[PDB]
Nucleic acid binder design. Sequence first.
RNA 1: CGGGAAACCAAAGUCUUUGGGUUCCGGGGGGAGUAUGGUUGCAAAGCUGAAACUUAAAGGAAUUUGGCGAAGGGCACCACCAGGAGUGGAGCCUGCGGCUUAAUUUGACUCAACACGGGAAACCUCACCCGGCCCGGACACGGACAGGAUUGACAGAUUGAUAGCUCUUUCUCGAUUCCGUGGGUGGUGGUGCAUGGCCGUUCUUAGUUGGUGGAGCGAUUUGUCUGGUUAAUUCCGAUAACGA
RNA 2: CAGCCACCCGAGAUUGAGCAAUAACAGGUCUGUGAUGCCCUUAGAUGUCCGGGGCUGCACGCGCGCUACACUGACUGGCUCAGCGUGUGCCUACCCUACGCCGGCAGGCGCGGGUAACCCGUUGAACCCCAUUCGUGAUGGGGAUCGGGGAUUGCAAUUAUUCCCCAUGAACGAGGAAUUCCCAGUAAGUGCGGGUCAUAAGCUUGCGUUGAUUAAGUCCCUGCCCUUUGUACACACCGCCCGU
Length: 68
Amino acid sequence: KSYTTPKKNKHKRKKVKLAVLKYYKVDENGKISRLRRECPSDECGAGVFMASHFDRHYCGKCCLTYCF
RNA sequence: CGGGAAACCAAAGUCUUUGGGUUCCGGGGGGAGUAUGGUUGCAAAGCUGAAACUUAAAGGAAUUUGGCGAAGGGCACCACCAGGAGUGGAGCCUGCGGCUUAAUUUGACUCAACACGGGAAACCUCACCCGGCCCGGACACGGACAGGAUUGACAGAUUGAUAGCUCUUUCUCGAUUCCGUGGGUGGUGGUGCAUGGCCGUUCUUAGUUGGUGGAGCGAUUUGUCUGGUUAAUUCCGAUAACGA
RNA sequence: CAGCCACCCGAGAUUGAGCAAUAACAGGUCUGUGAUGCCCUUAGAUGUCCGGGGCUGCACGCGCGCUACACUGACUGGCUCAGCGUGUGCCUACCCUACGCCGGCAGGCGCGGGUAACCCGUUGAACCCCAUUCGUGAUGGGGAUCGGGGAUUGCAAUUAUUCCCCAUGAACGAGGAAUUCCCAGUAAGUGCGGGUCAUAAGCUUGCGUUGAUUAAGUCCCUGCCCUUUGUACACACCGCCCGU
Ligand SMILES: [Zn+2]
């Protein structure tokens, strides 16, 4: 029920639509162009990408941060 | 002998196998030996004496535990005598009550609670408190679908932590899930005055019970006792009791 | 008669302990359990989990225990005698120690033994015995309180976990009313094992050494059991029942 102390809500992940639009760029030619840097770790595959931050990228379940 | 409901009775006997003669007197218990009327008396008060109403009991005899401010016995170093060590007085450890505390968690209060719960706890113990995350809400019904129902986290504000528990920021797991209702699980939450089991105490004292038979209409009683002995209802013995 | 006492012979002419009848307590345990009825909670938890704290906090009152008040003694050396036991784990990592060095000390590294009458271990235990110092003085009694330093256990010792070394040296002069336990290897003075245990016993249960004074009785006190008697009680005296 409603207690005296406030409670922060859980991390409700907002649904993002048409994410498959935002992975590759499509031109008149059939050659694709990836928009994200690829993770070279052997735990994940070659189809996964990295996170899109504003300073540096971030891998998936590998949780490895690579600088420049 | 006989009789009675039995205590008991040579009369309370000679009584359904009722009948010797003759006076007074009682028909559940209260109201009530009261009111009125008469009568007797100096007075107090004696004699005769109802009804209305109310109740399903009031009473008599007698056996077993019960309870005595009744009597008589027996046993016990958790009772005493004669003694030994002592405790209670001093300091320390432990437990309980009280005060105090955000909390100082709780049960047990004469034997039969207080170094007890196998309780000598720094953290787990923990059942108590200040605080924050994980779900360990199974399974069904109805909303959302592989285009995503969510878990897993990094320069920086942040408790407490590099628990991403949040907020800047999105690849990662793919139908294993999120949401409302039934329902389910977990609970050192409450009730031992609902219990089961276990244990303690009366009691570790020496006390219980049938079979046959005797007595009484019967409940019931003797056996299980006046006495002697023993740690002992342990034996002996007097004895309608023998055998267990 | 049941049996009792003393004596001779003979190891013992009463060694100790386990279970312990019918019936009953509103005795204790829902905090031993996945034994459990009902009730409460269940996502923002009364479950679970983590960090830290508190069960230990003190004007005070009570019960089990330990050390003492000393010369029947304290201190310092030497002599010499035991028995129950225990000892390397499913989860699991905490086993018992001989032997040679370092250090006054607790403790530190290697060489080993034992899955056990094999190794610790002939468990060289304490009390006791012998010889000096001390001399009735709150004193070499008593060791509370406390300061500094050094080690082990563990992630963490502060509200000293514990141990060791040096200082500190209070109360206490055999204790009021009251009260506990005990008849022979008994009480008592002493030590050693087991449980608790990561470090650990002023507690409990066992083992062993030295080892007595008094009693072979009673119902006075404290309780229990039984017989006789009385009952207007049978919810049983916490009973029944009279009157304004
Ligand atoms: Zn990767």
